[PDB]
Design a protein around this ligand. Structure first.
Ligand code: B12
Ligand code: B12
Ligand SMILES: [K+]
Ligand SMILES: [K+]
Ligand SMILES: [K+]
Ligand SMILES: [K+]
Ligand SMILES: [K+]
Ligand SMILES: [K+]
Lengths: 177, 137, 551, 551, 137, 178
């Protein structure tokens, strides 16, 4: 229950912030990612990673689309730095920025089951550096050729579920963690 | 009108493949690329060529491929950055109805891209009904 | 107690796979679902008013596109009334010419043709695939990637792949900004290994077309289409934007195909309660309707979804057969991981391998699977020997061939040097001679010195931001002494100017000779007819490493 | 320097396999050898005077036997003159009935029919095989053996295999003198796992026949024939002694088939310069001629011979197809190790698995290959989950099914207790309760307590020497409380009185119901006709372990 | 004469099947085996049954099979031991021609196994030609 | 040349021997088994095990068939004990016994690549115990499922070659081991 609804999130007007956008069921209908890490630790670690870089960190929920690219774009439009962090309930995560095509990004973590808390931290960190207009070394590439064989079906199902909470045209909510 | 028996053009009628400049396939050499006789600007496929290929597709009984090729022939005269702006304008929730029609008028009036203009107009109409216009998300 | 028999079985790799019971309502079912529409068509004043039970009043963007552009209406009513079991028979009957069937299939509705192929077992499907494949000659496509986006290894691995037999090769990126670097590496290397191999760099749509605009690719494949409208939307496209894009590539003289595959809709959360096969059929007709020559399907990246359910692998074969039967080029996947089991993945591959398709794999991994940036392929570099042996055992041309170590090493080396020249001439962050060495004898990125990816990503984005095009690579090649390569690259450009390779199933073999379904027409008519492995190609396939001379 | 790539490749299991270049002089070529006779036949007053180029003056025992008994001479001229291509086309044409073809093929000479199938690729052959298979329903046969000849473990393993779906099971012996115990144990456990499973004990011919006379076997398969005279002679038979043996079995009401297989003549040193396939066709016609109903072939035990040379595994499918096309039951091998590679053995298996044969394997190993006394099988106990998975994936009935652990423990335990009871009843060396428990949870003989071998061997031969028959087993079972089994064993004995299971492809299913090519006629006529996996059988096959219900 | 329609005998005409000692299928119950009201000596297929199956074979298109069954019919009267003896005698290098001809003579006079004795005579003649007689190795 | 034909072997008259019968190429055209164990060391070990049991070993070359069973049969025919060991140049080995059908035996070693010099020794011991009318425990079973995959093609080729030295109708030759 750590994520408290609170009014409709609004624009930045302050570059020194990074928004984290999460899916309509994040910490709601689902509270652990696809290999069971609680949303709370992931949220804690991303926020710690950004704050740790000296950047503000703002958490909002998106409802227009369960697709992670679009969740993150909903966020980058309102982030004062132009940088967002999108995360679905199953854990898939992307670092995005205003002006990018929705299906483009700064960095992407396309294999949710390989992500660790230490990974989620670094992501909070490389985002902040991006907000500072710095070009950090990308978080190293994690790839496992058996991840799809082990988890693609599970992922499908997790995603189908979060998708029931999509609600068209409903603006993203600012959240208190 | 080109038939399957004229294919492949490179082998049967390479002379049919010419630049707006008289140059031939045979002219595209290291030697002239270096000596700048040949440049980027000579190396773009022409509408004339794409319509030959369309005629061949047709003859091959692939009418739809041929339609694609006719569209492509029209679009050769459209700047790359304009090509990308129009493609992006057709993506979901990017454009107003009015914007799409302006795009279609431009294709028709400045580029004589009659088929693509009609295609973009058809899209505009359907994006209304299927709510894929700007503000529909 | 525990049976020790079952403890041994529980430990098998196959038991690591994801299996699920069918879930009809979320379309987690591979084919023949009770929710799939009954085929039908209604035509009035030359336009479709009803498609598979749906009135035009209710058509989504996909229906409209298919109804308007994807079906031949002159014979639609005739074929609708034909017996589906009889059409299925026609499909595998070796004495019913491909040319007699195509006018029939192209008049079917998505549901009708699904219905036809759902009467078939995989043996009948393979019997029909060898006839319906558009190019007489089967081919192969390879992935060339690595987890570091190391352009030297890509150049090296690309030339080895070309040398082994792949006629198309595909790269992609761990870190998107590297992309210009992966493309030129792939192209240069692929050109060194065998002049004429076509290359692509698989990215976001607007990003990829630009790269082709710059001359750093010779075709594109992952031009995605989807089976339901809300999934299509999250795909960030409609049928019309995709149709326009397809024509935009052609207008730049670039070959392309759409990509689809069973399971995508489920994976992406909106299956509209239909079966994967039905949904995929809509994808194939979108492709036909847009006038695109070919399609990548057979589940492709969502193979974990149909493979989880009963008859999902049969269904993957079925979507490939519908693709070819609709007179589209088929690049028939076998490019993505779905299982921990070698037995299982072999079965899945043989479905396409045995009859042959336009591209038996749409991405055999030409690198070790650890290095495969599509999250792993159904086959990787460590299977090359197994693949050659099976060609020899069954006398099947799988598109590849046994090769000699010393040949590979030189070509990998030449490619590594060619790229080094190019980075020299274009003033890009240099490639040490140590790097060239490594790449020559590498197996994978584990053997590579690592680079300054920040430096690299800096100079790769400058390619796009400054619009530096392929001619720079050409002059840098020539500048470095590779006048050979330099010209071969000019010859791709020559091919783009003539457009012959825009046609169905086109590849470029031997001396810059296009080989397409237009000049390599499939004329299968049963035993001793159609494509037959023989002569020097057979000799080449027979010559696997390790064959002792009996005496 | 070395290529790390080729280094990784060198280490793959496939490169441990034996490969050789064709050695034409010694028949080390799989098919299409230049020394193979061209098809011909000459007939005068109802007798052959020429067979495939060879004058009757030159006939060896094999030519005489085939010429006199193996070819339908009424249409021989007719079929000889027909085009081999057209005949091959007929083979795979779904609209040409099996019944139309059989009168044609059984009129062909060995060289004629080899020439006909050599025009086919493996796809076409599988399309033909699904049609020419004699029994409509495909089936499976398993090996049940262990390295210690442990009778208790054979009984348990026999019951499990039967439970999993094998309809024939085969045992054999490390130590020859052990045979009677192996057979009784095989026969008891099998009836326990599913009444009607047929059982055989593969031995020296005279030894096997006596065993059958004593009632401890249901059938015989390893009744060998060979394709050249010197090899037949080193096999210690002639076409006439083998034809007499086949009738002797039948005269005792026992079902039997011959065994042969490509490469045996090469392996035994006299190929007479001919291809394995030509030689195997002679073996198939020897079988036909003898009036034997069926055949185990597909290289069988000599599979490392054709698999060593090009197109060897295709020739293996082609020899199976010839058997079926001659209207002989086909037990299609898939029962013997030839490769270290899982991909390669899968490709070999699917040739028969996909279209189905009378017995897809003539010896899948129902025990782990360590215990396989036929020197290992192409599949074994630890592949059971994969086989089931592939069945579900392609919707193919491979004749087996997923089973539950507790079901298996229970049926294994009941068979061990039954054979314990048998042994007590017959005064054979005790089978302790620990042994019974061990057979129950065993994976293989590693899990079994050792037995006084010398002892067992003593009483087993006595069974022979004192002519103890299967009625002792029957009463011993009823005496020990196993009335069920006792009756079930009676039933199999009763099947030998009626002669029904002597017909082509017979097995016994359900309630003592013979299922042969006579009452289960294959009626293939394309898609949606002939045998189709569906209904409860499909439900059974679908139900593999590990499948999550999205709920 | 039996036809494919008559098979399986055990389903369509169990009455047709009797045994050596002339007993019925239904005679074969566990208790009759316990009681010994049926023995080993009575569980043997008969020449008549094999001839019923041969007719069905013929009807099913399988003449060779039928002939095999006819031979099986004659051999039912030959005891197990002599069967083994005769089978062994026909193996390479075991018999003299004369010994085989005596076996034939026996099969015909003792057992009336006319088809089988001709089969043996045939074997002996060819064993001379192809040298598979005793002393030929 | 550790093998010399010293005329036609003749029927043993006392039950104190075992005959080792070897194929027509053994110690001739072929000198090692299928995995390179010398023909010299196999016989030595074979002989050691027999002699080790107080039995005499007599060695003969067979020519009428290269088949291991028939090779052994020629030898069980001439064995004063009625026991023989047949050995092919590739290594395949069988313990046979007068009165058994040819394709029957006492013990069979049907996977030659698995045999070691110790196995052979053991094989020679069991023979003597057989000749002595003991009931020895069979030599432990050697079975490797990958045996045929690695060596069947090799075995067929070695057998083809040995098979060329076959001589129809030619009585076995007694050997003297150098
Ligand atoms: C399966 C897959 C897909 C599937 C499913 C995507 C989905 N949204 O459900 C399909 C084929 C539809 C797809 C499409 C695209 N993909 Co994709 N995809 C993958 C693949 C092969 C494996 C991922 C996986 O199975 N992970 C295992 C499961 C257990 O983990 P997961 O966290 O749940 O996985 C999810 C994410 O990977 C996500 N996803 C997949 N692709 C993409 C792409 C983007 C930009 C985003 C934000 C998310 C995303 O979908 C998975 C299922 O929910 C990867 C390769 C890789 N390196 O992982 C490429 C990959 C991630 N895809 C990529 C691309 C470019 C795209 C496209 C933009 C291509 C196009 N033509 O438009 C589209 C984007 C569509 C969209 N809305 O996501 C690139 C990204 C390159 C980069 N950003 O640096 C990759 C690396 C390689 C490639 N070319 O395929 N993809
Ligand atoms: C391949 C094989 C054959 C092949 C080739 C035989 C040959 N002579 O070339 C074929 C199918 C023709 C065959 C036939 C028979 N076989 Co076989 N065969 C095998 C098998 C499956 C594997 C052997 C192998 O590949 N070894 C690996 C190679 C590299 O080593 P190798 O030393 O060169 O192997 C040779 C020996 O195994 C030899 N051989 C094979 N079978 C037999 C049988 C006997 C009696 C003898 C003396 C030799 C012998 O042939 C191999 C190749 O030359 C084994 C099973 C096992 N557990 O080993 C059964 C096995 C040896 N065979 C067996 C039997 C019973 C026979 C037959 C008598 C059956 C019959 N219907 O008559 C015939 C005998 C024919 C003959 N003259 O040898 C038994 C032996 C039982 C015993 N004596 O204890 C075994 C153990 C299997 C079984 N129990 O069913 N066999
Ligand atoms: K793309
Ligand atoms: K799809
Ligand atoms: K691909
Ligand atoms: K046998
Ligand atoms: K054979
Ligand atoms: K078998």
């Amino acid at each position: 229950g750590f994520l408290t609804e609170v009014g409709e999130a609004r624009q930045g007007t302050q570059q020194d912030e990074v928004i984290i956008a999460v899916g309509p069921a994040f910490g709601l209908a689902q509270t652990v990612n696809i290999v069971g890490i609680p949303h709370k630790s992931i949220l804690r670690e991303v926020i710690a990673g950004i704050e740790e870089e000296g950047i503000k960190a703002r958490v909002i929920r998106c409802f227009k689309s369960s697709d992670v690219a679009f969740v993150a774009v909903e966020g980058n439009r309102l982030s004062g730095s132009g940088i967002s962090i999108g995360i679905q309930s199953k854990g898939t995560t992307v670092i995005h920025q205003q002006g990018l095509p929705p299906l483009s990004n700064l960095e992407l973590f396309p294999q949710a089951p390989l992500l660790t808390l230490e990974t989620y931290r670094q992501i909070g960190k490389n985002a902040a550096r991006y907000a500072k207009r710095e070009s950090p070394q990308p978080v190293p590439t994690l790839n496992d050729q058996m991840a799809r064989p082990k988890y693609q079906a599970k992922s499908a199902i997790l995603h189908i579920k979060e998708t029931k909470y999509v609600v068209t045209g409903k603006n993203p909510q600012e959240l208190r963690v | 009108s080109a038939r399957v028996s004229d294919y492949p053009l490179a082998n049967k009628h390479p002379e049919w493949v010419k630049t707006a400049t008289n140059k031939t396939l045979d002219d595209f050499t290291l030697e002239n690329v270096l000596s700048n006789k040949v440049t980027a600007q000579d190396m773009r496929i022409t509408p004339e060529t794409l319509r030959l290929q369309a005629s061949i597709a047709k003859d091959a009984g692939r009418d739809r491929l041929a339609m694609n090729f006719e569209r492509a022939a029209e679009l050769t005269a459209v700047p790359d950055d304009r090509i990308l702006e129009i493609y992006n304008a057709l993506r979901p929730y990017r454009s107003t109805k009015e914007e799409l029609l302006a795009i279609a008028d431009d294709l028709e009036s400045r580029y004589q891209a009659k088929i693509c203009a009609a295609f973009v107009r058809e899209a505009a109409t359907l994006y209304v009904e299927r709510k894929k216009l700007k503000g529909d998300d | 107690m525990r049976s020790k028999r079952f403890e041994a079985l529980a430990k098998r790799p196959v038991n690591q796979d994801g299996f699920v019971k069918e879930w009809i309502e979320e379309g987690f079912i591979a084919m023949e679902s009770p929710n799939d529409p009954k085929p039908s068509i209604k035509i009035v004043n030359g336009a479709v008013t009803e498609l598979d039970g749906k009135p035009v009043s209710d058509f989504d963007l996909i229906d409209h596109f298919i109804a308007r552009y994807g079906i031949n209406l002159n014979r639609a009513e005739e074929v609708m009334a034909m017996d589906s079991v009889k059409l299925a028979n026609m499909l595998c009957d070796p004495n019913v010419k491909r040319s007699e069937i195509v006018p029939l299939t192209t008049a079917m509705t998505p549901a009708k043709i699904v219905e036809v192929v759902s009467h078939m077992n995989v043996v009948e499907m393979m019997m029909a695939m060898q006839k319906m494949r558009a190019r007489r000659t089967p081919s192969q496509q390879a992935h060339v990637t690595n987890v570091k986006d190391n352009p030297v290894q890509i150049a090296a691995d690309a030339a080895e792949g070309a040398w082994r037999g792949f006629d198309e090769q595909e790269t992609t990126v761990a870190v998107a900004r590297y992309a210009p670097f992966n493309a030129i590496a792939l192209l240069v290397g692929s050109q060194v290994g065998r002049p004429g191999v076509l290359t692509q760099c698989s990215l976001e749509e607007a990003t990829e077309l630009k790269l082709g605009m710059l001359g750093h690719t010779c075709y594109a494949e992952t031009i995605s289409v989807y089976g339901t409208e809300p999934v299509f939307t999250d795909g960030d496209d409609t049928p019309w934007s995709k149709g326009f894009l397809a024509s935009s590539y052609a207008s730049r003289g670039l070959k392309m195909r759409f990509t689809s595959g069973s399971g995508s809709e489920v994976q992406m959360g909106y299956a509209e309660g239909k079966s994967m096969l039905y949904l995929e059929a809509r994808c194939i007709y979108i492709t036909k309707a847009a006038g695109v020559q070919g399609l990548q399907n057979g589940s492709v990246s969502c193979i974990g979804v149909p493979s989880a359910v009963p008859s999902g692998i049969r269904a993957v074969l079925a979507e490939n057969l519908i693709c070819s039967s609709l007179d589209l080029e088929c690049a028939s996947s076998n490019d993505q991981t779905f299982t921990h089991s070698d037995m299982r993945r072999t079965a899945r591959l043989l479905m396409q391998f045995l009859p042959g398709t336009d591209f038996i794999s749409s991405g055999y991994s030409a690198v070790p699977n650890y290095d495969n940036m599509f999250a792993g392929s159904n086959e990787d570099a460590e299977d090359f020997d197994d693949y050659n042996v099976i060609q020899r055992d069954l006398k099947v041309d799988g598109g590849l061939r046994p090769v000699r170590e010393e040949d590979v090493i030189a070509i990998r080396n030449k490619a590594a040097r060619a790229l080094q020249a190019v980075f020299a001439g274009m003033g890009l962050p240099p490639i040490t001679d140590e790097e060239v060495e490594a790449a020559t004898y590498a197996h994978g990125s584990k053997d590579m010195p690592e680079r300054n990816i920040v430096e690299d990503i800096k100079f790769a984005q400058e390619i796009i931001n400054k619009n530096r095009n392929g001619l720079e690579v050409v002059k840098a090649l020539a500048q470095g002494g590779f006048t050979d390569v330099a010209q071969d690259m000019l010859n791709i450009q020559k091919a783009k100017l003539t457009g012959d390779y825009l046609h169905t199933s086109a590849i470029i073999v031997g001396d810059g000779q296009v080989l397409s379904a237009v000049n390599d027409v499939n004329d299968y008519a049963g035993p001793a007819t159609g494509y037959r492995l023989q002569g020097e190609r057979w000799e080449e396939i027979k010559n696997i490493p390790g064959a002792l001379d009996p005496n």
